[PDB]
Design a protein around this ligand. Structure first.
Ligand SMILES: CCc1ccccc1
Length: 163
């Protein structure tokens, strides 16, 4: 298990434009296209991202290319953020994957808002952090995924992604 496999499990793979859990146009492995309700706007974003005139459909290789870029962007974003970087630096590699997962799902600004959770994670108060993380819109709206990510933060193992 690693961050790519983890996010592939959590996000799935779809080669045609679909709506994500929030109703937003997305493609590939959780590549958000736009928050606009316009499918035409989403298609335009897709074409720009891929570099060709699509039919709203991409190949697996194209989906994986966007995914690579998106994981890289999530990490980059953490490292550029004054609130997130010190917590990320404090974590082991498994828990770092949980952090990347959250930023991939909700963005750098969104995760940086988990101030109290972040402090508990830096303090390595794992059970307390887990409880705090669950007191969130995130957990309520995507509880199964959040439970997997939280278990990863709680235990520093991949147990929630095995079997
Ligand atoms: C709240 C989890 C986290 C920790 C460090 C960096 C980003 C995200």
């Amino acid at each position: 298990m690693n961050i790519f496999e983890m996010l592939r499990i959590d996000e799935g793979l779809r080669l045609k434009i679909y709506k994500d859990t929030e109703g937003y146009y997305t493609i590939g492995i959780g590549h958000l296209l736009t928050k606009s309700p316009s499918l035409n706007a989403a298609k335009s974003e897709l074409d720009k991202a891929i570099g060709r005139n699509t039919n709203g459909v991409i190949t697996k290789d194209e989906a994986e290319k966007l995914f690579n870029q998106d994981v890289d962007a999530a990490v980059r974003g953490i490292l550029r953020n004054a609130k997130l970087k010190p917590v990320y630096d404090s974590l082991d590699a498994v828990r770092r994957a949980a952090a990347i997962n959250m930023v991939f799902q909700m963005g750098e600004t969104g995760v940086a808002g988990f101030t109290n959770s972040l402090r508990m994670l830096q303090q390595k108060r794992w059970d307390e952090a887990a409880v705090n993380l669950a007191k969130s819109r995130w957990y309520n709206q995507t509880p199964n995924r959040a439970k997997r990510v939280i278990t990863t933060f709680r235990t520093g193992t991949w147990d929630a992604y095995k079997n």
